[PDB]
Specification:
Layout: E1 2-9, E2 18-26, H1 30-34, H2 46-57, E3 62-68, H3 70-73, H4 80-92, E4 101-106, H5 111-119, E5 127-132, H6 139-163, H7 174-186, H8 200-207
Parallel strand pairs: 1-4, 4-5
Antiparallel strand pairs: 1-2, 2-3
Helix pairs in contact: 2-6, 4-5, 7-8
PDB class: hydrolase
Keywords: Chameleon sequence, ribonuclease HII, fusion protein, Hydrolase
Assembly: monomeric
Length: 210
């Protein structure tokens, strides 16, 4: 039986993309995955993590990595939860190898409504197992977290080369606020790297520049 795990990166930051990774592994390939200590990846360095990335791929029957830029996210014609569910589904419906069981990281509490919302959005037959904040609980979801996280890091490390110190990218991080604030100064507008929608972006315009 085919097993899939799905996770997503960049949900909280206000600058940068949001990556959704879905992977499909085989019932007999599961072992080789835990042998990679995927759960114990939070400790690894970016380079060692990137090493894990290429190894995960080599043991997966199939995988998809969706990357959502801030312009797409900050322009959804609906809610945010909806955005995830739809993208989590598109990602799965893109898997050439269809899974029978899918273990997903519930974008928010009430993992049952999430598991249902996604189900009715699958163009194929499969059962879903959602868990809010699946902290390394499901090895299949851990591997998806890696690919989504590596992909995100690369996109951010490139944003630094074009803008410099952009901070952690979180709306609650002053360094990111300064950066935007200062940028919103000599340009009157925000960089094409921010999700024009976060209430955070509001205060920035009222604090400085009055």
């Amino acid at each position: 039986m085919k097993i899939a795990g799905i996770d997503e990166a960049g949900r909280g930051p206000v600058i940068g993309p949001m990556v959704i990774a879905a992977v499909v592994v085989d019932e007999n390939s599961l072992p080789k995955l835990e042998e990679l200590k995927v759960r114990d990846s939070k400790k690894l360095t970016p380079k060692r993590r990137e090493k894990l990335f290429n190894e995960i791929l080599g043991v997966l029957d199939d995988y998809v990595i969706l990357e959502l830029p801030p312009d797409v996210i900050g322009s959804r014609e609906g809610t945010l939860n909806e955005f995830e569910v739809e993208n989590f589904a598109k990602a799965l419906n893109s898997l050439k190898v269809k899974p029978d069981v899918i273990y997903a990281d519930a974008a928010d509490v009430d993992e049952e409504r999430f598991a249902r919302e996604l189900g009715e959005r699958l163009n194929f037959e499969a059962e879903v197992v959602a868990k809010h904040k699946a902290d390394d609980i499901f090895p299949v979801v851990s591997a998806a977290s890696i690919l989504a996280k590596v992909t995100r890091d690369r996109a951010v490390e490139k944003l630094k080369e074009e803008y410099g110190e952009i901070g952690s990218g979180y709306p609650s991080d002053p360094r990111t606020r300064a950066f935007l604030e200062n940028y919103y100064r000599e340009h009157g507008e925000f960089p094409p790297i921010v999700r024009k929608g976060w209430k955070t972006l509001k205060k920035i315009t009222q604090d400085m520049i009055n």
